């Protein structure tokens with residue numbers, strides 16, 4: 001399970017696709033099993049005091065990698081359903097988290113301040129097929145206050161497949177920071193877009209916007225695992241291709257699966273990762 005030379009990768013994808021995607025099915029099933037002999041604790045996610053702070057009962061934050069909020073002057077005020085996730089050759093390159101609930105808006109923005117995050121990647125719509133996926137944690141216009149964080153919408157650009165919102169935030173304790181949200185608007189929950197190029201462009205533009213030297217890029221959808229994990233793997237493998245001209249989806253995915261449960265939720269999303277890299281390689 002070593003890295004694959006980029007010049008051999010598209011051929012590799014053809015083989016994985018063949019025979020009703022036998023190879024992809026094997027890879028993904030190996031991913032889903034790779035936790036088998038691993039118990040990973042998530043005591044804080046399961047504590048009664050924190051239950052209401054989880055969007056989904058089955059979607060937890062592993063203790064070892066969870067993002068801690070600085071405690072407030074409650075015993076569990078340190079909890080948010082969020083995990084550090086590695087990037088290419090960089091620990092804690094991302095924070096992967098659920099779509100914030102109204103009850104966690106303050107926690108969410110406090111994390112962003114405390115972690116010095118400058119980029120938010122959002123990969124879900126607020127509502128999909130009439131179903132609630134994420135509450136709107138930013139102001140529709142002008143400014144809104146979440147705890148001691150005041151968020152001000154500065155500009156918006158709406159492209160065909162994603163929207164870029166530029167915010168200014170400040171701590172009432174003032175100190176101000178730019179936060180840019182990259183919001184992909186056409187990616188269904190538990191699904192994949194038909195074409196990978198628009199997501200490839202989205203990943204390239206949102207990744208390039210990362211400022212040195214700043215906090216982890218925050219990535220979320222609704223549960224914060226499926227689309228979120230898919231983004232993280234594509235971004236990370238683009239980096240590896242840039243650095244070493246090799247690709248290691250299977251190995252990198254098995255690794256981050258120890259950092260937050262269920263990253264990359266479906267075989268279809270697993271395949272979509274490969275399609276995006278293929279588009280980059282051939283392009």
Ligand code: VO4
Pocket residue numbers: 124189190221222223224225226227228265
């Ligand atoms: O909102 V997700 O189901 O893509 O983790």
